[PDB]
Amino acid sequence: KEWQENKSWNAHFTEHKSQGVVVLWNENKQQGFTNNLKRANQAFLPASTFKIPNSLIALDLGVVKDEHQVFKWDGQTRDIATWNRDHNLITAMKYSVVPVYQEFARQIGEARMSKMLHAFDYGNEDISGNVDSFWLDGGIRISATEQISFLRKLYHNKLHVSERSQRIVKQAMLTEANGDYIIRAKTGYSTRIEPKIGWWVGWVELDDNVWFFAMNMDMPTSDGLGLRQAITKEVLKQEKIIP
Amino acid sequence: EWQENKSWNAHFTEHKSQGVVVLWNENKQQGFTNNLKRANQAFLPASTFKIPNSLIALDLGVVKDEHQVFKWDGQTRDIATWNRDHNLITAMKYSVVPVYQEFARQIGEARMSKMLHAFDYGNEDISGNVDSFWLDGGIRISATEQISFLRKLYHNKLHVSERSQRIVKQAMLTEANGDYIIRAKTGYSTRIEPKIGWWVGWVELDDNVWFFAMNMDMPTSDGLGLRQAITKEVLKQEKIIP
Numbered sequence A: 001k002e003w004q005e006n007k008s009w010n011a012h013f014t015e016h017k018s019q020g021v022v023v024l025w026n027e028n029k030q031q032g033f034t035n036n037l038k039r040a041n042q043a044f045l046p047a048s049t050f051k052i053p054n055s056l057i058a059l060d061l062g063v064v065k066d067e068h069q070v071f072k073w074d075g076q077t078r079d080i081a082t083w084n085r086d087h088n089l090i091t092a093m094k095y096s097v098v099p100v101y102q103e104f105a106r107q108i109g110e111a112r113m114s115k116m117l118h119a120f121d122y123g124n125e126d127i128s129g130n131v132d133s134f135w136l137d138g139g140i141r142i143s144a145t146e147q148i149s150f151l152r153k154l155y156h157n158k159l160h161v162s163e164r165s166q167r168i169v170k171q172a173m174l175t176e177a178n179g180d181y182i183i184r185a186k187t188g189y190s191t192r193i194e195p196k197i198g199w200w201v202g203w204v205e206l207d208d209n210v211w212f213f214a215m216n217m218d219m220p221t222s223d224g225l226g227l228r229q230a231i232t233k234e235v236l237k238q239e240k241i242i243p
Numbered sequence B: 001e002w003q004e005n006k007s008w009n010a011h012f013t014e015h016k017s018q019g020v021v022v023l024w025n026e027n028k029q030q031g032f033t034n035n036l037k038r039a040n041q042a043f044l045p046a047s048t049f050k051i052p053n054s055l056i057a058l059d060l061g062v063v064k065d066e067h068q069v070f071k072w073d074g075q076t077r078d079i080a081t082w083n084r085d086h087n088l089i090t091a092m093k094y095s096v097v098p099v100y101q102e103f104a105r106q107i108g109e110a111r112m113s114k115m116l117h118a119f120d121y122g123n124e125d126i127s128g129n130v131d132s133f134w135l136d137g138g139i140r141i142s143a144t145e146q147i148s149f150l151r152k153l154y155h156n157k158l159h160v161s162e163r164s165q166r167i168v169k170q171a172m173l174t175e176a177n178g179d180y181i182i183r184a185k186t187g188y189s190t191r192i193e194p195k196i197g198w199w200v201g202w203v204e205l206d207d208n209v210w211f212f213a214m215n216m217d218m219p220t221s222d223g224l225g226l227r228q229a230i231t232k233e234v235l236k237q238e239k240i241i242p
């Protein structure tokens, strides 16, 4: 089959009194796997996973020159300590620094953002709402399977932006690497509009294959945020993708 | 500019080993070593030569990109991971000599010689076979010369395309987590005394980069793990990694 439902993965959610979906895509076999085919195709606010396309657009338009360019703290002190400092594209991604990406979005502006998301075939392509918040409380919606379609294009340098912009964002997505695998990914937490959900989207690079992944889960409180990565890794371990 | 810290000798002594670690603090423009003399002694690069080889092969279009497949020739060699297909990422990870021998042949002596001059790489001498000179030929490079070369690569200042430099830095990816990223290449000079192990690269932190280059005497393959282990003991002592 091209898509396979594996309800056995539901145990990794229920074991934590959680609900959500993991979607995997085996690039060599062109085969997908999920615990929940319906939720795999349900569209949600992307929240901080939108830093991938936002970074790409900012780079391709020269809003961001390169991964070294420094974005000065605005002096407004905020809840998350790591945000109250200067950043570059690498640290802004790592610490998911909202204010930096709000400024990128304002400099990209409404018209270029809407055109680029259409060029990317990104989710419902709807940027209705505030130009500097629509991915957290506007009209944009993307499903786990749509996140995978977008990430496969980025992985292959097939998005309609320069190869250089694609290579810089994939560098900035680096999360973990050892002698067994490389993960390039981005977390999100949709907190403003119900339902509150966590995201983790990206891919696992092996020696001879790539496994794309997109997961979301109900996230009523920040208490469960570590389960985004932990449930994903339980599934990757079950499927013998990582040791 | 250069500070000798003989207190690091304990990390070699403790493992009944001899060698040099060179660190470079990019933000402060300050270098540190256990041994100024050995830091400036030139050795065969062995598999550390895969960095400049990769760069030249990408810049000339001998390698199209990091996905291009180099087919196994069906000849069983001693290192099991070599006996299969590779791309640039796995060829570097497993240090696959046959792949790089073929790159060196397609590049040719003339283009190889000019590019190592452009890189100011070691003694820029490619005497010996086009496809072994880094293991038993004329090319030699010191730990301090590795750092100069790596700093250029890190900044995209080598005389090759930006694209070539980014692709090789991707191929050098060795380890990453929430505290650091290491981009590096191992080597083992086995043919001509002194038999040594290399580990060269850098540690990316949020707010700085620490370049490193280490070699150590390696009389048998037993000690190869010490290249990374001793380097990490020094990085942990200097509070660079936890």
Ligand SMILES: *C(=O)N1C[C@H](NOS(=O)(=O)O)CC[C@H]1F
Residues within 6 Å of the ligand: A046, A047, A048, A049, A095, A096, A098, A136, A186, A187, A188, A189, A190, A191
């Ligand atoms: C993004 O989804 N953000 C920014 C910040 N943290 O994001 S992340 O899940 O840690 O990557 C707070 C949640 C939301 F506003």
Ligand SMILES: *C(=O)N1C[C@H](NOS(=O)(=O)O)CC[C@H]1F
Residues within 6 Å of the ligand: B045, B046, B047, B048, B094, B095, B097, B135, B185, B186, B187, B188, B189, B190
């Ligand atoms: C290069 O140094 N090589 C190739 C191979 N392994 O190299 S490495 O130390 O693992 O990078 C065997 C020794 C030497 F010929």
Ligand SMILES: [Cl-]
Residues within 6 Å of the ligand: A170, A171, A174, B169, B170, B173
């Ligand atoms: Cl990378």
